[PDB]
Design an enzyme around this catalytic site. Sequence first.
Site, short mmCIF file in Angstrom:
data_model
loop_
_atom_site.label_atom_id
_atom_site.label_comp_id
_atom_site.label_asym_id
_atom_site.label_seq_id
_atom_site.Cartn_x
_atom_site.Cartn_y
_atom_site.Cartn_z
N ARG A 32 0.83 -0.98 -0.04
CA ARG A 32 -0.14 0.42 -0.13
C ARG A 32 1.23 1.17 0.06
NH1 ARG A 32 0.88 -1.73 5.90
NH2 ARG A 32 -0.17 -0.34 6.93
N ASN A 50 -6.52 -1.49 3.86
CA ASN A 50 -5.63 -2.65 4.48
C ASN A 50 -5.62 -3.06 6.39
OD1 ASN A 50 -2.73 -4.06 6.22
ND2 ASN A 50 -2.48 -4.69 3.31
#
EC number: 3.6.1.7
Length: 103
Positions: A32, A50
């Site tokens: 990410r 996430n």
Amino acid sequence: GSMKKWSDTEVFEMLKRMYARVYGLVQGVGFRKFVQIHAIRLGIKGYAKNLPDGSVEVVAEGYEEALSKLLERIKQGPPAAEVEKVDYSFSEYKGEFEDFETY
């Protein structure tokens, strides 16, 4: 040679929400974050949520030139984890996210 001519495709207004559902062991590692570097570099909005359950959803948001860049980045340069089945979905933007941050 030619006589007639035309130009097309330039950054102007608006942008599309690219939903990107990234599956696998991409939790923990800077997946990410990597998506962040390029997104930020290219002026992309969204959020990389996430949830620590293998299946991390991203709601990145890009124009066209900036879209293709951020897209071509991800697939070409996979994360430093066992990405299982990154099944993204081209969608449309309901609204723009306040910049782009990671969970």
